[PDB]
C-alpha cells in the first residue's frame, strides 16, 4: 500500500517555545480541499520549529454544539454547548493555550463587550504530538490567534498542516508509528451540507473500507502494516503468563438531544476507520456542530423507506464523510 | 450471500401473556457453543407463543461490572457495578420483568438473607421484538426464573434462542428487516478467557470483516442487501427538499476505571459489525464483566511491542470476540 | 418540644420471604391525607403488613417528560426513562423493582395489549433498602405494584407510614440510633402553576428543619436527643484515626429537556438542606423531575421583583421549598 | 447586627480590555490571612487592580488524584483532569481560563521542558463570570496565572477580596440587589487528617448561615435587609404568571477513584446549605475534590460512636462543614 512514514524514536531533551523567535506559518498542507459552506471558515497555522500547529473552525454567528469526549485521556477546554470557534491543536495539554489566542481575538472583534449573551465561546481539544519530534515547542496563544487570522471560507489544507503537523498512528510500539496528518471531507445533498474535520493521532491504526491497514503499525523488518490486534493477541499468549480530535459540522436543525446522540453515533462510527479506538490511552473528542439552517421533514418517509429521513439517517451519512476525512489524513 | 430471513409486515392486534397457558421452553437454538469458563453459567428460555425469550448469564460468586448504555432508546434495570446475573430479554420494557424472576430465585437460594453485602444483584436489558411477530407475549417473571433454572456452565445456544428468538436487523423499512438471533464466541489466550454474548436487534445491518452486508435491509425486488447509508443518502437527496444488548465477560482483573473504559472501547468497536450503531433509535447496552482472577503484568512489554500487554490490548482482543458473536447471531 | 423517638430497633437482616405468606395488598392511608388539585396525576400507595413494606405509584396517563437525577452511590433504578406514564417508588431494595413490573403489566392490559412504539407504557422505578427496619424478607412484588396502581387516585396522598414509606428510616451512623421516617408530600399552587413533591427519605443522614434542628434520625437513647451525624463522625475520626431517598417533583410548567434536567439537579441538591449528609456513597438517592407541559413561562424573565425572576431557576427554588416541606412531613 | 451592604452597583457589561493597560500582577492579601499546616499544598492569589479581577492557584507539585463535579448549567472548565499538579480558579468568564495556561507553561519550564507522559504538568481551571461587578473587560491572562503560581506559598490563604474572589458577587434575581462576596478558605486537622476548603462564591443565589439567615446577596436597598430569593421568585410568579461557585476540597486521606468521585458529589451538594439556590442553570458550579493520598482510613468503619462512623462518607460530612465555613468567610 502506501509508502511508510515512520515517525522514528522519541527524542526528549529538546528546546521549548522561549528558545526560538517563533513565526507562525499559514499551513497549506499537501493540497487544498475547497467546499461551499457559508458561515464556516477554517484557519490553520504551524511553527516549523515544532513542527506543531493548530487548526481553527470559526463560525462567527455561533453554533449549537455537542461534545463526545469518549476517550480515556482527553485534553479539552470549554466543551461548550454553543461555540464561535473550535480549536484543535498539538502540544498535549499545553496546546489548549492556542484556544486562548482565539478567544482573545474574538473578544477584541466584539469591542470588549461582555454581556452574558455575547461571550465568545471557544472549545479546544489537543493531541500529544511530542513523541513524533525532538522539540518541546507547543501551540501557544500567538499561534491560535494566527490560525484564526488565517481563517477563510471554503478551504481546508490536507495533510501535514495545522494540528496535523506531527500527528501519528499505531502505538503498540514506537518503532512502528507513522505520521498521519489532518483531513477533511465535504458532502452536499439537496440543501444539506456536512463537513468533517479530523486530526487522527490514534493509538490504533487507520483502516480503509476494505479492511486494509493503510497507516500505522508499519514494521520495517517486513515492509507490512499489521492490525494491532495481531500484536496484542500474541503478546498475551506470550506474557500472560510467561487520540483523535474531530468535528462534524452540518446545517441541519437538531434539538439538543438529537445533536448529542448524533455526536455519539458519528464518533462510534470512527471505530470503522481507526482501530482500536476509544481506548484508555486515547483522548478521543468529537464536536458535533449545527448551524441550524435546514429543517428535516416532520415525517421520515421517502421512496427509499418509511424510516429514511431523520437524524439517525443524517448520522449515517455524516459517518461516511468522517471516514473519508480520516483516509485523507492518512494518505 | 445468505438466504433471506425477512421478518414481514407488522401484525398488531395479537394476544398477550394471560391469553395462554404459557410453558417455558429450554432454548437450544441451531447449535450449541461449548466453552470452558468456570464460574459462568448461561441459561436461555423462550415462549413459543411469542416467540420471545430471555437469556441469563449467571455468575454465582458475583462479578464487577461496567455498563455502557450508549444508545438513545435504552431499556435497562439495575445497571449495577457488581452482578450475580445479567438478564437479556425481548418484550421491550415489559421484558425487564424477566430479571425479577431471576432476582427472586437468587434470594430464595440465599435463604432470604438481606444484609447489604448479600443482596443478589441482577442487571437486565431488553430489545423491542414486537414488530417481528403477531402476539404481545413478553418475557415475564416466570420466564426469567426458568432461564436461570436452565443455566449450565460452558454452553450457549446460538441463533433463535432465548432473547434472540425474534431479534431482527435493518430497519430503514420494515419490508427489508430480517430475523437475526443471538450469538456467542469465546477465546482463551494463555490463562485469559473472553466470552462475548450478543442479541443484535439493530436499526442497522450486520456487516462482516470484508465489509459485506450479511443480515438486514434485504430487498426482495433485487435479491440483495444494501448498507443503510445508500438508502439514507438517496432519501435526503429526494426529500430535503422535495437495539443491541450484549455482554463481554473476562477473567482479567481491571480496576473500575479500566473496566469502564474497556466497556466503552468494546462497545464502540461493534460499529464495525453493526452499521449504523449507537443511534437515537437504538437502546444499545453493553455489560463488561470481570471475574477478577488473572493479573495483567505491571509493565506492558512483550516481543510484540513496548505497549502490547494492557487493558486496551485486552479490549482490542475482546472486540474481535464480540464481532465473531455478532456474526454468529446473523448466520 | 423535641419529637418522641421512633427507633427502628436492632436489625437481623433476614426472615421469611414473600411466599411464606398469603400476601394481601392493603391500601395505605398513613397518618393523614394530603388533598390537592392537580388533574392528570394520581397517586396510589399499597403495603404488605407482613413486611411491613410498600410501594407508591404516581400515574400520569398522558405520559410526561421526565429527568432523572440518580446522584447517590447505591442507586436501585429501573427504566429511568425520559418520558413516563408512571413512577413507582418501593421498598425491598433491588427486589422491589419488581413492583414497577406490576404497574407496567397493568398498563399494557389497559392498552388492550397494543405494542406499537407510541403505545409502549413506560414506568420508571426506584427503591429503598428497608430490610434493616424489620425482621422479614418480604418485598414489593408485581402484585403490590399492580395494587398501588389500582388504588391510585387524583388529589390525595397518604402521609407517614404508607406505601414505600412503611419501613423507611433515617440516621445510620449506628443502627441503634436509626428512626422510622415515612413518606411525605407537599403541594403549592401559584395561580395556575402547580408543584407537587413526593419523597421517601430512607437516608444515611438525618432530617433537619429550617432552623437547623435535627428532627428525625440519629436519636441517642442514652442522651434523649438527636445530634447532627457530623458530631459522631468527627469524634469517631479522633478516636480511630489518631496521629437512600427516592423522590419526585411534578409540575405543570413546560420546560425543555435541558431546563428540566438542570431543574432536577437543582431541586435534588436542595434536599441536602433537609437531609444531612445526603448524596453519599451509602445512599441511592434518586429524584424524578416530571413536567406535564401545560403552562408556558413568559418569554422574558422580568417582573417587579427583578430582571431575572421568572424562569426555570425560579421555579426550581420554589419547588425546592415544596420538597423540603414534603421531607418534613415524612419525618413528622 | 445585620452585615453592612456591599452592593456591586449597576452593570454596564463592557469597558477597556487588557491591552488598554500596562497590567502588573498584584499579590493579593485580602482582609485577613488564614494560616494552616498542610505540607505539599501551596496557594497563590494575584489580581489586576484595573479589572478588578484575579486568579487563585492551588499548587500540589507531587500531583494529586482529583474528581471534578461540574454540576452547574453554565460551567467554564479547562482540563478537568483526574490527576492535577495545580487547580486554577479565576474571574473573567471563559476568557479567564487563560490564567491556567500561564500556570501550565510555568510548570513546563520548572520541568526543564521535559514532555514525557509521566512529566506532563496537569492544570485544571474553572472560572466565574465577574464582568457585571465592574466596568472593564480585563480578564485573568497567562501572565496573571503565572504570577499567582509564583506567589503560591504553603499554609496561607488571603480571605475576602483577593485572587479569583476580587469581583465575585452574590444574589442575582436583580442586579440592583447583588453584593460583592470574596473568596474564602477554612481548614481542620483531626489528628493527622487534614481538610482544606477553598471557595469562590459568585452565585445566582445568596449566602446563608447555619441559622438560615441570609448574610450576603439579595440586599434590597429599599428595605435594608436581605430576603431569601424564593420570596422574590414566588412574588414574581404570582405577578407574571397569573391564572457560579468554583471550589476545591483538598484532603490527605486516601480515597479510591470511586470514593473520591462520590465524596466530590456529596460535598458539592452540601453547599446548597450555605448557597441558595445552588446548582442552577444560570450557575457554572464546579467543585474539585483532591486527595494527596497520605493517610489510610481503617479497613473497617467502626468506632465507639457507631458501626458506620469511619469511612469516606464520614469524611465527606466533616469536609462539608469545613466548606460551609469557607463560604461564610467569603461572604463575611
Author numbering:
A (entry chain B), B (entry chain B): 19 to 260, 267 to 355
C (entry chain A), D (entry chain A): 18 to 260, 267 to 355
Publication excerpt:
The values of Tm (melting point of the heat denaturation) and ΔH (change in enthalpy for the global unfolding of proteins) were determined by regression analysis using nonlinear least-squares fitting of the CD melting curve. However, the D2 symmetry was partly altered by mutations at position 122. Plotting the protein stability (Tm value) estimated from the CD analyses against the distance between the two monomer molecules revealed that the protein stability exhibited an inverse correlation with the a2/a1 ratio (index of symmetry). In other words, the ratio changed from 0.979 to 1.197 from the wild-type (Asp122) to the mutant (Arg122, Lys122, Val122, and Gly122) enzyme, although this value should be equal to one for a perfectly symmetric structure. A clearer correlation was found between thermostability and the nearest distance between the side-chain atoms on helix α2 and helix α1. Notably, this distance decreased with an almost linear correlation with increasing thermostability in the wild-type and mutant enzymes. The side-chain atoms of Lys122 existed as two conformers, with the distance of one conformer showing a linear relationship with thermostability.
Nylon hydrolase (NylC) is one of the three enzymes responsible for the endo-type degradation of the by-products of nylon-6 manufacture (cyclic and linear oligomers of 6-aminohexanoate (Ahx) with a degree of polymerization greater than three) and various aliphatic nylons (e.g., nylon-6 and nylon-66). However, the post-translational autocleavage of the nascent polypeptide between Asn266 and Thr267 generates an active enzyme with an α subunit (27 kDa) and a β subunit (9 kDa).
